[PDB]
C-alpha cells in the first residue's frame, strides 16, 4: 500500500525479552518494550506528548495512564485513528488522549506546543525521516524530550537473505531503514541533542518469530479484519524479519535545548 503499507488494524509492535530463559508471554514482552521506551521519556503528569505513528493507540494509553500525561497521537491511517480513539474512550481517557490525522512531515501544530514526543516503531514509515525529525524538533518546546523506538540495520546482508530484506521492507512499509550512526546523525542534524542510545536487537529479535506464531495461531479469527492476503503479508512480515539477523532494533532519547 506504499504509504499505507504496514499501517492499519494489524499494526502490531514487537516485544522485549531478557535472554532465552525469559518465558514471558507475547503481551508481557510487548508491555515491557513500551515500558523501556517510557523510561527514556522524562515527562511528568500534565505534560503534553505528541505520539507520532500511534499504531492502534495502546502505547499512548499506557504512557498516559502511567505518567499522567496528555497525549495527541497522529497517523495517516483513518483505521488506526478510529481504533485508537475508541480505545481511549473505552479506557476512560478520552479527555486526556485523542487521535487525529497528520502527515508527520507536515505536523498541524504550532511551534513549541509539546513537552514531549513519542515515536514507537513509526519513523521508518516516513520516506524523508530527517524532515519528520525536523518537524518533531519544531513542535517540541525548548527542553522538550523525544523517545524513539525503531528498526536499524546492523550491517550488510548475506546475499541469500537480500530479497527477504526487501520483502520485509516492502511489506512492512519500511521506507527508511538505516544504521545507528545515520540515525544518530539525523537526530543531531534536526537540532536535537542525543541523550541516550541503546541497541536492544538481542532483546527484541526473539519477539519476531513469536509474533508470527501468534498470528498463525489466530488465522481463523483475523480473516474478517484482513483478507487471506492481508493475513499472509502480516505473517510474512514477521517471519522475514526473523530470518535476517541484521534487522536490529534501537531506542533513542533526545532533548531540544
Ligand atoms: Mg508497525
- All three cell numbers of 134, joined, read 525536523
Cβ pair 17, 29 in contact under 8 A: yes
103 is an annotated ligand-binding site residue? yes
Closest CA to 124 of 237, 26, 41: 237
Ligand 1 centre and the CA of 257: distance in Å?
30
Upper half-sphere CA count for residue 170 (Cβ side, 13 Å):
8
Compute, in angstroms, the gap from residue 18 CA to the centroid of ligand 1. 22
**CB of 54 closer than 8 Å to CB of 60:** yes
Resolution of the determined structure in angstroms stands at: 2.0
List residues bridging with 118 in a β-sheet: 51, 147
Determine the Cα–Cα distance for residues 108 and 7; give it in Å rounded to an integer: 20
| Residue 173 annotated as lining a ligand binding site | no
Neighbours of 101 (CB within 10 A): 12
DSSP string, 80-141: HHHHHHHHHHHTT-TTTEEEEE--TTS-SS-TT-EEEEEEES-GGG-SSHHHHHHHHHHHEE
Helix/strand/coil for 180: helix
| Structure method | X-ray
Q: Which three cell numbers stand for residue 114?
A: 509539546
Instruction: Tell me the C-alpha distance between 62 and 68, whole Å.
Output: 9
* DSSP 8-state assignment for residue 158: P
Amino acid at each position: 500500500s506504499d504509504p499505507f503499507a504496514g499501517l492499519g488494524a494489524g499494526n502490531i509492535h514487537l516485544g522485549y525479552f531478557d535472554g532465552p530463559d525469559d518465558a514471558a508471554t507475547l503481551a508481557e514482552a510487548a508491555d515491557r518494550l513500551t515500558d523501556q521506551l517510557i523510561a527514556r521519556l522524562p515527562v511528568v503528569r500534565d505534560h503534553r506528548v505528541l505520539d507520532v505513528g500511534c499504531g492502534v493507540g495502546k502505547p499512548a494509553l499506557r504512557l498516559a495512564g502511567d505518567l499522567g500525561v496528555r497525549v495527541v497521537g497522529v497517523s495517516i491511517s483513518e483505521a488506526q485513528i478510529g481504533i485508537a480513539n475508541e480505545a481511549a474512550r473505552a479506557a476512560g481517557l478520552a479527555d486526556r488522549v485523542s487521535f487525529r490525522y497528520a502527515d508527520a512531515m507536515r505536523l498541524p501544530f504550532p511551534d513549541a506546543s509539546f513537552d514531549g514526543v513519542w515515536a514507537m516503531e513509526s519513523l521508518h514509515h516516513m520516506p524523508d525521516r530527517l524532515q519528520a525529525l525536523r518537524e518533531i524538533a519544531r513542535v517540541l518546546r525548548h527542553g522538550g524530550v523525544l523517545s524513539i523506538a525503531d528498526f536499524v540495520q546492523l550491517g550488510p546482508v548475506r546475499e541469500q537473505d537480500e530479497e527477504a530484506l526487501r520483502a520485509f521492507r516492502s511489506g512492512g512499509g519500511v521506507h527508511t531503514l538505516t544504521g545507528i550512526a545515520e540515525y544518530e546523525a539525523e537526530i543531531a542534524d534536526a537540532g536535537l541533542t542525543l541523550t541516550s542510545s541503546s541497541d536492544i536487537s538481542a532483546n527484541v529479535r526473539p519477539s519476531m518469530v513469536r509474533t508470527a506464531e501468534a498470528i498463525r495461531g489466530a488465522a481463523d479469527a483475523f480473516l474478517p479484519l484482513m483478507g487471506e492476503e492481508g493475513l499472509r503479508r502480516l505473517i510474512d512480515n514477521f517471519e522475514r524479519a526473523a530470518t535476517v539477523p541484521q534487522i536490529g532494533y534501537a531506542l533513542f532519547a533526545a532533548r531540544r535545548s
